[PDB]
Design an enzyme around this catalytic site. Structure first.
Site, mmCIF file in Angstrom:
data_model
loop_
_atom_site.group_PDB
_atom_site.id
_atom_site.type_symbol
_atom_site.label_atom_id
_atom_site.label_comp_id
_atom_site.label_asym_id
_atom_site.label_seq_id
_atom_site.Cartn_x
_atom_site.Cartn_y
_atom_site.Cartn_z
ATOM 1 N N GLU A 1 5.335 72.633 72.656
ATOM 2 C CA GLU A 1 4.303 73.648 72.800
ATOM 3 C C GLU A 1 3.152 73.381 71.820
ATOM 4 O O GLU A 1 3.389 72.976 70.677
ATOM 5 C CB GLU A 1 4.922 75.031 72.551
ATOM 6 C CG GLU A 1 3.936 76.162 72.320
ATOM 7 C CD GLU A 1 3.275 76.666 73.586
ATOM 8 O OE1 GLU A 1 2.561 77.683 73.496
ATOM 9 O OE2 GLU A 1 3.466 76.083 74.668
ATOM 10 N N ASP B 1 9.418 74.300 75.140
ATOM 11 C CA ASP B 1 8.653 74.582 73.921
ATOM 12 C C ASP B 1 9.058 73.734 72.728
ATOM 13 O O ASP B 1 8.205 73.295 71.947
ATOM 14 C CB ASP B 1 8.754 76.063 73.557
ATOM 15 C CG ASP B 1 8.132 76.949 74.603
ATOM 16 O OD1 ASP B 1 6.993 76.673 75.018
ATOM 17 O OD2 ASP B 1 8.779 77.929 75.007
HETATM 18 MN MN LIG Z 1 7.779 79.578 76.139
HETATM 19 MN MN LIG Z 2 6.120 77.188 77.081
#
Ligand SMILES: [Mn+2]
Ligand SMILES: [Mn+2]
Length: 180
Positions: A61, A89
């Site tokens: 992310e 992420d």
């Molecule tokens: Mn997320």
């Molecule tokens: Mn994400």
């Protein structure tokens, strides 16, 4: 809400949130609730990655999409781990799994199930936080120690309070509902 956002989150987070919105044709000046939500998700992801031992997490992310997929590919090719259908992420080198982090103004289980049905993965771990101190994670495995999660929970409640203080909370909470 736009001015609140710009003084609530650090400039680095704010900058990353603006870039992400533009890539989707979204104006941060108009969709200000989305703007707040995106900053919040970024901050939580970065807090979470800080919760482990120094080398524990690969951060996905906040990267440019192309490079994000490149790093994901590097992890998959070198660990054998199944390739996610959507950008996760973090990658957890200790537990050897990708992590999808969610932050919701709705119930944690509702959001959790939507995320699980979307990603369709038996490997990617899902960990959802709320603005009420609730959390839900795959197999009740919360990854981080209690202290690291609590800090995140505290921060989210402060954001909620700071919004309510300005009369922005109701609209922010409702925005996710309308979007879904
Ligand atoms: Mn997320
Ligand atoms: Mn994400």
């Amino acid at each position: 809400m736009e001015d609140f956002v710009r003084q609530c989150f650090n400039p680095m987070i704010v900058e990353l949130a603006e870039k992400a919105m533009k890539e989707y044709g979204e104006d941060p000046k108009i969709e200000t609730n989305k703007f707040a939500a995106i900053c919040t998700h970024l901050e939580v992801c970065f807090m979470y990655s800080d919760g482990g031992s120094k080398h524990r997490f690969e951060i996905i992310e906040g990267r440019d999409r192309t490079m994000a997929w490149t790093v994901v590919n590097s992890i998959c090719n070198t660990t054998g781990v199944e390739k996610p259908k959507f950008l996760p992420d973090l990658y957890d080198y200790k537990e050897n799994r990708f992590i999808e982090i969610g932050v919701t103004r709705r119930e944690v289980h509702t959001y959790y199930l939507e995320k699980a049905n979307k990603i369709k993965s038996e490997e990617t771990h899902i960990h959802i936080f709320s603005f009420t101190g609730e959390e839900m994670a795959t197999k009740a495995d919360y990854t981080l120690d209690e202290e690291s999660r609590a800090r995140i929970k505290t921060r989210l409640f402060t954001i909620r309070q700071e919004m309510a203080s300005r009369g922005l909370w109701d609209s922010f909470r409702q925005s996710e509902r309308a979007a879904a």
